[PDB]
Design a protein around this ligand. Structure first.
Ligand SMILES: CCc1cccc(CSc2ncnc3[nH]cnc23)c1
Length: 167
C-alpha cells in the first residue's frame, strides 16, 4: 500500500492521473520523482522548468555542479540527484527530443532507467515540448517499465485521450 490517490490502473504496474506533477510531488513526497531532463540538466521549461521553479532553483544549482563534475548525460540516460522539497530523490531521465532530431527508439532506453526504482512518480517521457506522440510514450512505458509507475499527465484533454485509446 502506498499514498498515491485517484489514479486509474492501466496494468499490473502502471497507473495514470490527470495531475500537475509539481503539486502531486508536494503532496505525496514520493521516494522518486522523475524529471523530463535534457543532457545538460538545463531545466528551462516543460516539466523540468516547473520542477526546478518549485525548488526555488536549488535543482538547477545542484545540476550545474553535477555537470561541471561529470559532463552531460546521454540521450536515453539518467542520473539520481536530490528531490529537494518535492521527493527524496529526483531521477533525471533524458528522453529523445524530436524537435532536436533524436532517435525515437531511444525512448525505450530512457524508460529502462525506471526499472532501477521500485516506485516512481513520473511524466510521460519525450511528451510535451520534447515533441513525441504521448500515446506512443505511454505504450513504450507500459511495455518497458516493470516497477510501479504513477504517471501524472498535466493536460486534461490529453489524459482523456490517453485513457480512451489505451489498449
Ligand atoms: C513551480 C510549479 C509549476 C510551475 C509551472 C508549471 C507547473 C505545472 S506541472 C507540468 N508541466 C508540464 N508538463 C507536465 N506534465 C505533467 N505535469 C506537468 C507547475
Amino acid at each position: 500500500v502506498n499514498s498515491f490517490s485517484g489514479y486509474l490502473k492501466l496494468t499490473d504496474n502502471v497507473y495514470i492521473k490527470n495531475a500537475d506533477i509539481v503539486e502531486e510531488a508536494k503532496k505525496v513526497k514520493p521516494t522518486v520523482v522523475v524529471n523530463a531532463a535534457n543532457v545538460y540538466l538545463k531545466h528551462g521549461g516543460g516539466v523540468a522548468g516547473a520542477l526546478n521553479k518549485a525548488t526555488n532553483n536549488a535543482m538547477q544549482v545542484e545540476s550545474d555542479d553535477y555537470i561541471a563534475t561529470n559532463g552531460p548525460l546521454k540521450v536515453g540516460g539518467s542520473c539520481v540527484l536530490s528531490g529537494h522539497n518535492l521527493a527524496k530523490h529526483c531521477l533525471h531521465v533524458v528522453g529523445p527530443n524530436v524537435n532536436k532530431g533524436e532517435d525515437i527508439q531511444l525512448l525505450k532506453s530512457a524508460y529502462e532507467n525506471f526499472n532501477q526504482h521500485e516506485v516512481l512518480l513520473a511524466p510521460l517521457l519525450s511528451a510535451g515540448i520534447f515533441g513525441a506522440d504521448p500515446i506512443h510514450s505511454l505504450r513504450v512505458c507500459v511495455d518497458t517499465v516493470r516497477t510501479n509507475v504513477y504517471l501524472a499527465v498535466f493536460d486534461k484533454n490529453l489524459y482523456d485521450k490517453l485513457v480512451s485509446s489505451f489498449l
